[PDB]
Every structure is written in C-alpha cells, then in structure tokens.
Symmetry: D2
Subunit: 380 residues, 4 copies
C-alpha cells in the first residue's frame, strides 16, 4: 500500500523453507540436481542465479514497479551491462554532465568497441531530438545529475525514445525508488548504484537494474551470465537489509536538506546553491512533476579553495570521504576530487569553481547538521 509498507513487505525476502523472516545467505556456487536437468528450485549455478541475489532482484523490481531485477557487482558494472545491449556502430545519447565513471566507461572503454556517444544538454529535450542520428539506439539520462543537480524531463525523454525506437535508460541513483519511478513514466530500464542510498550504510558496492520489458530482461540476463559482473550473496543480503530503512533514511535526509538549504541561502559566505527544491532551479517544476521528494546531494559555492578546505576542517559532523548516500553526512570539493584533471578554465566554465562544495546529507539530527555547517561557514 503506502511506500514505507511496501519497503518492508515488497519483494520476496523470507525463506519459504524454514520460515526465516530474513533472506538466507546462500554462500554457495552450485546445486544438487535430482536428475539431469531437474532443478529443485530452479538453481543450478550461482553465476546464473543465486537465491540471495534473487531476493535483492525481486526487491528492486518491486520497488521500481518493474518485472525483472538484476544485481551487479557495482553501479558501473550495471551500466556496462546495459551498454552491452548495443553493438559496434550503434549510438548513445547521454546527458552532458553524466557521472564521471559513466563518462569514463563510455569514452575510454566502449568507444574502443565502436559504440558512438554524444553528450548533450538534456535539460531541453529538443536537444535530444536534435542529437538523434539514424544509428542512435539508446538514450541514457541521470536526473538530477552530479554535482550541479541538473533536472531532465523523464516522461518527455521516454516519449522521444518511444517515437524514435530507442531503449530509454534512467540512472535513478540520486532519487532512489522511494521518490522517483522512471519505469512508471515510460522508461525502458532503470538502474542504480546501490552503493549509495539503497545499501545506505557505506558497506556494499553494488548495482541494481530493473525493467518491465521481457525481451530487454532476457538480453540483460544473457549479458549478466556471459560477462559475469554479478553481485555476491553476502552483498545481496546487506543490500536487502539496508533497503528496509530506505524510506525512514530518505525522509530524515529530506528534512535536513530543506533546513540546510534555508541556512545556505541566508548565509553571506555562500553564493550559488544547486538543488532541485529551489524554485529558481532550472526544471524545478519538472522535478516536482516526476518526483515526490529530493535527493540529499547539495552543491554550493564558497569563495575559493582555501574557504572550502576551511569548511571541511571546521565541521564536526561532515566527513571528508568519497561516495554519497551514507548514514554519515559527507563533504567533498569536486574541483579537487572529481574534476582535477579538467583544465582549470574549463572547470570554471562548467561551474565547477574552486569553491564549489558538495555535501551528501546523512541522517544526523537536523539542527546539529544545520548548526555545524553554519558555524563552520561563520569561520569564513
């Protein structure tokens, strides 16, 4: 029924055999057959299918309102499998500010395999229409993107993809299935770095993929079984476990996000703030139309590199680390950590200034997070 209930009771996460209320961890590679070809419960080799992985796959399929779920050893393994749906000579359209790992995979791995790629600004969907070639087969979008949280219209993207015969893919990592369901808006394939919010505890690297399309599912299953980027059973179990508190965590994160943004907008040491909840944010109306909540990732400008480093040093509750979606609040400086290889003037041109700070809001107390960040900003 309601989302917090579906998080607890959706999917198959109990043991039919013993009645165990949690998914057993099938730390196993192979299965007895009673007769050649006769599988007791459909299992025969863990690369092909493992019952704990099947549990997490059923969960992600349920939460995204799809039919089929797939668990990979990482978000970029999920992305790679989805790209391997294409052939040499096929063309992909992606949003221009796609995640660095995705950009790297496409432009340094899959271009060597003849897959052609264009990065366009999808905040205007007619950019997609202009970019479509006769060889285009896939449209891949993240929304909102990293680290400036650009918003793309999912439903229009899906209509465009259907009209031109494209496989549509949404990287729904930042929003999670709790707030945004791309398959409900016509998208063919939805994927996640479960490493972030879904696991939620900074202790699993994993990717999840969901689709309602039987034929795409068969192709993804063949690719998963053939290239073998499968998530193991212990990590699958921890994923199922972390997803149970997804709703509670996301709601706490959202309360803090809203209060933190009020503070940031008021503070004199802060210039621009980037987040889809701000009403002057580009495609704010689109985000509210396609989601019923917010990501916990916020970016905002301070004056320069030394101010950003000072901010990191002065916060007690914001931790300097890579990744997002932890229970801890995390802080980073894109220009030094994710974009340091881009020349400085191009960094500035894209908005990745020296003083651009990205925080990933955790589940600490809202007042503590607001007050800590404010006092650290006061030291500037």
């Amino acid at each position: 029924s309601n989302k917090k209930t579906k998080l607890i009771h959706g999917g198959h996460t109990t043991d039919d055999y013993t009645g165990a209320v949690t998914t057993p961890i099938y730390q196993t590679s192979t299965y007895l057959q009673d007769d050649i070809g006769d599988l007791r419960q459909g299992y025969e080799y863990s690369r092909t299918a493992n019952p704990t992985r099947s549990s997490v796959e059923s969960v992600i399929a349920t939460l995204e309102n799809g039919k089929h779920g797939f668990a990979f050893s990482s978000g970029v393994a999920a992305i790679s499998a989805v790209v391997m749906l294409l052939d040499k000579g096929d063309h992909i359209i992606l949003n221009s500010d796609v995640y660095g790992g995705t950009y790297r995979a496409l432009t340094k791995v899959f271009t060597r395999f003849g897959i052609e790629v264009d990065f366009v600004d999808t905040t205007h969907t007619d950019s997609i229409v202009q970019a479509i070639r006769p060889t285009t087969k896939m449209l891949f979008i993240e929304t909102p993107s990293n680290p400036l949280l650009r918003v793309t219209d999912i439903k229009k993207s899906a209509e465009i993809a259907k009209e031109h015969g494209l496989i549509s893919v949404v990287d729904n990592t930042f929003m999670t299935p709790y707030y945004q369901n791309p398959l409900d808006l016509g998208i063919d394939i939805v994927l996640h770095s479960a490493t972030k919010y879904l696991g939620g505890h900074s202790d699993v690297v994993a990717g999840l993929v969901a689709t309602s399309d039987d034929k795409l599912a068969e192709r993804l299953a063949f690719i998963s079984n053939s290239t073998g980027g499968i998530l193991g059973p212990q990590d699958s179990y921890l994923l199922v476990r972390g997803i149970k508190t997804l709703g509670l965590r996301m709601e706490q994160i959202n309360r803090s996000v809203i209060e933190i943004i009020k503070m940031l907008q008021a503070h004199p040491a802060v210039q621009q703030v980037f987040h889809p909840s701000i009403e002057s944010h580009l495609n704010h109306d689109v985000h509210m139309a396609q989601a019923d909540g917010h990501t916990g990732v916020i970016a905002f400008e301070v004056k320069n590199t030394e101010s950003a480093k000072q901010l990191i040093k002065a916060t007690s509750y914001y931790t300097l680390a890579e990744s997002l979606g932890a229970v801890e609040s995390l802080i980073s400086v894109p220009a030094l950590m994710t974009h340091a290889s881009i020349p400085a003037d191009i960094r500035a041109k894209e908005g990745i200034t020296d003083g651009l700070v990205r925080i990933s809001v955790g589940i600490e107390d809202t007042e503590d997070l607001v007050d800590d960040l404010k006092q650290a900003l006061d030291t500037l």
Copy 2:
C-alpha cells in the same frame, strides 16, 4: 620455499594494524581522508581497491610468480576484462575446445563489438602460426581443456606470442598455481575461475588474474575500475581461506585420480579415458614438461546415455552437480548438460558421445572413490 609453505606464508594475509593472523573483512565502500587527496593506506573507494580484495590479489600474484593480481566477480568477468584489453578490429586466437562460457562470451558478446575470433586446434602450435593474421593481438589457451583434456604447449605458445607481438593468456583453472605456472613459461597473463579449485569449497564465484607486466596491469586495473566486475570482500576472504588448503586438496585429488584411472582402464564397461597422465594421451610429454601434477577432471566413455544415468544413480559418493574443484566428487554428462544444443552428429564427431562421463575428483578417501565408481560400473 616449498609449495605447501608458500601457500601458507605467501602473499599478505594478516592485519598489520592489530596483528590478526587472518585478513580482516573490509565490508565497506569508502574511506576517510585526513586531507583532500591524502589516503591513510592508499584506499579511497572500494570499487577501485578494497584491502580484503588486495589480500587475495597479493595471494594469486605470489602463487603464480607475478607482480600484479586482480579479483573479479567470476571467472567469466576475469576473461571479459582480459578480452576488453583489445579493440574493435583486433583478432584473438583461442583453442578450439575452449570452455563453453568463454566461447559464448567471445562469439555472442564481443563479436558484436567488432572483436574477431578464430578457434584452432592448439595441440599443434603451428596451427597457431597458421592462424595468425595481421590484426591478431591475443593468443588465449586453456590447458588441459574441457572435457577431453587436450594439452597445449605453453612455452611454445609464449614464444610464438612474443615473436608476433601477441598478448598471451592462459586459463590455468584446471591445473591451479600449485601444479602449473604459465607466467614462468613466458605467458603474459594467467587467469583462473577461482570458483573451482582455488576457493575449493563450492561456496564462492570468483575470477583471479595475475601478470608480471606493469603496463598490462595498468590496463587491467583501468578496465576493472571502469567496468566494475570486482569481487566483494566476503568472497575475497573465503578465497584466501580456501587457498590455504589448496596443496593438500590437490595432492589428495591426484592420488585418487591415479588410482581411479587404473580402475577405469581395467574396467570392461569403460572404453576411452581422457586425462593427461595417460602416456598415450596426446601431448602427455608436453604436460609433464610444463606441470608437476594433474587436474582432477577425468572424462571416460560408457556405452550410452542410459549407462551414464545408471552410473550416476548407482554411485554413493559422486554427486550430480555443475562445476568442479569441490571437496565433493562431482559427476556429469557433457552431452546432456554442456553440449545439448550442439546437434547430435556433430557432438559425436567431436567425441562428446552420449556415454561420455566427466568426473571431478574430490577429497574423499581414495579407496572409497575407486570402489564406489567400480561397483557402479559393475552394475552396467
């Protein structure tokens, strides 16, 4: 010093911090940085590197006398990463009877990316020389192969590869590093389905790769980080644990293999036996020159399908299941389980008859294994 000692003390499998005599399981995705870019022990994001995975990587590099190790979520993920060393238009030579998963990956995935493939009989290395094209970049061999245990000359393969500028790869799964070390014979890259003997307990799906070549290692690391088919920390730990008894297990398996082969050769219900220890086996001398022991996989002919099924039913200690390298002895019928999609007459032509049985010898008592298989054969 000696192999059984190197298995216990080779690689880094203790905790420098606490002194723990086993590798801690770093069930974690990210790491505190004391200052932007300053990593305490070189870790920053578990996809890129995880200390438990680093432990298993150091073990496989030590055991194969390489410099660099890589752990993947499965054997075919390892194979896929190695193939992704190439580009569209490049050509690979593989032995004709390569593992079905490898065949499937190459001919149904990577050919769509423009990688060209020829399967040749490498039991005569001049077949390799004849197959070399101007676009050939890689030579990939298994020895001994599945399920007829064809033997390929590793050292000559390496000389050919060096002369023609090819990356040489050996799938050393069936022999393990305990009996055969392709890097010592000039091969560039050695890989394993650690799912089989190395893990040894039927409870991990994993691949391992080792090389001494710094530049190949850098390319493999980039591919691993970009496509993300990484082995998780719990599975890495179980791999390090299972490898400790590799030598003891392989030696028990070899004692049973030798006695079982004597029995099979004597038995009237058994026709051909395939195993590199038999002196009339093709390239027996080559195997003895490049290995100091034997794989536990044996294939042998009984009369027909019903005899093979009867054999499976009548053994108490041979278990019907997929995979090999378990502590249990495993039994299978290739024509029904791994080659059932090949038309029957071509199956027969390749030697995959209806009565071809494959056993993977486990670590049960030698007399029990011999006697059980013999009494079951006596029921034919």
Copy 3:
C-alpha cells in the same frame, strides 16, 4: 550532541588503519605478537577481545552514557553473566513479571547454584524495601515489562539499591538507549537483548551490557572471558550497522504506536489496552519522568482465543512470529505462545487472558498499520 547525531558518530566504528568508514569484520581467533607479551593494539585472543566486538561494546557504552561495554552471544547470556556476579547464598530481587527466559534461567539454572530469588511487584518500590534480606545482593528490574508493560521507578530503585549496598540492574531492552538511560539515573548495570530493537532487523541474536563502574566492569570481563558467552564478529558488525538507524526506527514506531492506541481505545471489539503512554496506566507519570519516548510493544484484550486467531489471520501487515523490535510488525498470543504451561485459571488471574494479543509495532506506514489492524478487528 542530539540523539540522532550521537547514534551516527558515537563510539568507535571506523578503521583507524585504512580509514574505512565502517568497522572491519575481524573474522579471526588470534593475533601475532611482535615479542612475547607485546600486543600491537591490545589484542591477543578473540575470546578475550576482538576489535569488531570492541566496536559494538564502545557503541553501547556511549549510547547508555557508561564507561564499559560487553557483547554476549544472546540477551540471556548477558543476563547470565550479570547473575554470575553473585555467589551461592546471595539473594536477588526481580520484578514479578520478568521475562520468561530470565525467570527460567534464575529458577531452573541459578537456583541449583544456591542463588536465591524473589519476584516482587516493583511498581511500588516499598515492595523492594520489604523484600530485602540480609543476603540480598542484587536488584534486577525490567521496565516496562512483558507483556502488560508494568512500569517501575528506576531512580527510586537505584536509591534503594545504593542505600542497601545492592548491585542495581535494569533490562532496558523494550525502551532502548534512545529513550531511557538507566545509568544516568544511578543504576549500576544496564543490559539489552540486542536481538530486538538494537539490531532491529531480526537477523542477530545478541546481548549488550554497559556500566560506568570500573570494578563491576572488571568482574564482568572476567566472567565473559571465563564462561565465554561472547558475541562473534559478524554479529557484532551487524549490530553496529543496525544501531545506526535506531533513532529513525524508534521514532517511526512511536508515531504508529500513538495512532494505533487511539484506534484500539476506540474500537468496540477491544477491551483493555496495556501501554505506558495511556494516562490511566499505572506509573504513567513515572515512565514519562524516566523516558522521553515509548516502547513499540502493545498488549490489548479481545474476547477469546478464536477472536485472537481471527485477528492474526485477517491482518495483512502483522506477522505471526516470535521476538519483537523487527522492521516488520509482529503479532502473538501470550497465553498460547509464552504462558501456555501456566494453568489457565492462574493465567486469567495474572491478566494473561485467552484473548490477550501482543503486537510489536514495526516501521511500516502508520496509516497502513492502523487501517489493517482496524479492518481485522472489524471482522470480529
């Protein structure tokens, strides 16, 4: 600072060595010593101390404002260690309706060791004063108790214990450290079945103990090391992980508890409701004085056994299972499941009627839980 922040940042749950943001799982039994007696980080044998167990111990000590934490293989192992603080001839006072496992341990195990026990109604603390003998050494109370949620004055209990030289113990399982901190009220020892709310995910059996008393801590450590009921490292890790969301889970549970109680009090098929939030509940004022929230366990009367079974059958979101503190809402019938060996008329006398239902409220949506339970009650 505030509780939700302390839950994330309190205790030591990162790796000082690698910087890992989660506690490494030290699946290990022993530790290298650089010289006889010279321990690298104080570890020498995992029964005596394990770094992952030390992490969970530091967490429980922080959350209860104690100095010393102890993790046991189960709640009753924790209780047993605390009772083993006493000697033959010593006497314990416990509340009359103590948990069945505690009652069983005391009256069927420790009485055979000469420990003397009286169960008194501690809702009036002068009952404690009357029960004190010259041999009394310990006062052990749960509040609120199971399943009628009787409330005992913790602070007065502590004053009585101090005046008479008793070790005071509170089983704080039902409230958790998030809502009630007995050590802050003068109690010597606080314990928990971490199997319930602290783990929070129905996937760990564990006990936790905290004290500020150095000498009691030394005695508990000696008992733990000597009788060996220690929690293992994987379960310790899962405990640290589950505790991160304790605050969010307890707050969701409390919102549902309040709405469910309104519904139950209104419903014609429900007679008595037992919960400390009800203002006519005995010692309601005491509970509000010593806690700032509520347990999720509620008991209420329906007409008879068949009504209780019907209620269980008709709810979609209340699961029939043992234990409490899950993410799922759980339902049970004490008279059939926890008190079936007590003769019927004595059951009735204690208030354990045939129609007494106990629910443990989970973290499903509040409206779903209210509506589901109400429609099932409407079928009566």
Copy 4:
C-alpha cells in the same frame, strides 16, 4: 565409509530446499509460523535452534559417533554448559594439568556456586578411584593434556565412571574426532574447542559438544537455551567449511610431527621432548590403543628463557601467537605466556621450565618445518 569420505559426506550440510551443496547461512533471529505452534521446519527462535548451527551440530555428532550435537560461542562456553549439568554440593574430578581456561572457570567461577573440584593425576586411573567422594558426579579428562601431553586411559576412565554413576566427559580438542572418539569408548560427553583444529583456520572461536545420551542431551539443550552461549550462524558455517579439510590437515600435521620429533631428539640444544608418539612417553601404549594418530602439539626443553626467545626470533615459519590448530605453525613459551602467574619454583617443579617451548605444527611443507626449526636451534 573411510574417515576422509565421512568428513565430506557425513552430517547434513546441503540445502534440501534449493539443493545448494553448502549449508545456507541463516543470518536470522526468528521464523514465520503458519499457525500458532505450527513450525514449518521446527524453527521458531534462533537462540533455541538455527538451521546453520543445526548443520554444524549434526556434523560433530556424526564425526564423534554420537546422537546429539551442540555448538557454543567458545570452547569454555561448552565446558561451562557441561559443568552446569551439576548442582551446588556436587563434586568433579579433573586431570591435574587441565587447560588453564578450564582451571580458571572451575576454581574462580563455579566454586562460587558450590561446585567442588579436585585435580588429580589421571595417568594412573586408580587416582580417580581414590578421589571419588560420595558427592562426586562428574569425571572430566583431557588427553593428551597441555603442554606436557600427559595421556589418560579413556576406556578405563569410562568404566570407572559407569561403575560409580558419574557423568564422564572428555575434552577431545587436541586429538580431534579424526583420531580419537571417546564416545566409542563409553564416555558420556565429548567436547572440543572448535577454535583450534576443527575450524582449522584461526578465524572462529567456538565450542562443540556431542553425546549419545538422550537425557544428557535434553539437559544440555535446556542449559544452552537458558544461558544462551550459542554459536552464531556465520561462525557455524565457517566451522562446517573448515571441518571438510580436517583429515587432510591432520595427516599433513602428523607427517611433520613425526619428522620434527626425530630432529628434536637428535639435536644437542634440545633436552626433553614431550609427545605421545615417543615410545618412552608415559602411557604411550594407552594412547596408541585409544587413538590412531597424533596431536600436532609438541613441547620440548631448551636451556633457558633467552634460548627460547632466540628460537622464536630465528624461525621463519613458526609464528609467535596464542592458540593452536592453525594452518600456520605456532610457537610459544608456556612459562611466559600461560603460566607466568605461577611462582617460578612451582613452575620448575611441574616441568614448566624457562626453556620449555610449545609448538603447534601447521600444514607447511614438512622439510621446511624441520629445516627451519633445526637451523634456529643451530643458532643456540
């Protein structure tokens, strides 16, 4: 049939449901009931029973030829449960040199509960007969003992116990079920620190208990459920896994033990050697009558403390750490590590000289172990 086969196929260590060839890890605390009291597979609460623990319990019961198995959180938790079979006023006879942890538990914990204890030299069984009091209820023996490997006649001990109505217990840790089966010789209860050889990999702290006596089993089950020193599911799984290679490990250890003893007896820097395989060892004939192999623990005298420390420093393959039964060879100095609180002259009187070294032989290469220890002794 034969031991190495029974190790692989004895007990229930597969999943009946999915056919998984390894025991699933039931990381779970409770179980759905389809109707009040109707348990799907007999499980209802993991403290009472967990299917992974049930797997390891079935293994130890099979390997010791008993009916009932019990897994505890540690060896001393197993010992404590067995002692809790008795009441205040009951008396136990134990061998005089019982393990320090056992001595500490009995004399510092259970004597406070009125259990009376005498330590007698059981190498002459008439010492047992002389020590029997009218209150004696239990006879507890280790053989061979630590660290001087004194041997006690198990069968005569059992006859004495039967004649006088005593519960007989053997701590079979040092021999393992692979070489010595006390239940086959009339003993009531056999126990192990599975922390040592059975787990075999220095990564689990655990105890195991086996009996054929239904009534003793019922009492042990009640004590386990009431005091809760249960082994968790992950540790149970690792135990089942390590036991698979028990036979191979013990046989390698025994080959090295025999060669190492030849070397030690020849070496001029070594005086006395203590091990049951030496024909002049007291009760050598008894050991050979009741066991078909040897423990890997050896003790031997060098001149003094500085020689012992030098020996530790000079070995490459003997590791300074607590515990035994690892895959690594371990070395220690009892007088400094396990008996340092005993006054020096009493230490000397018992044979725990300053130069007494204890090694626990691992599974490294026999020649490496012999040569390493010999060259280190040559440096004296």
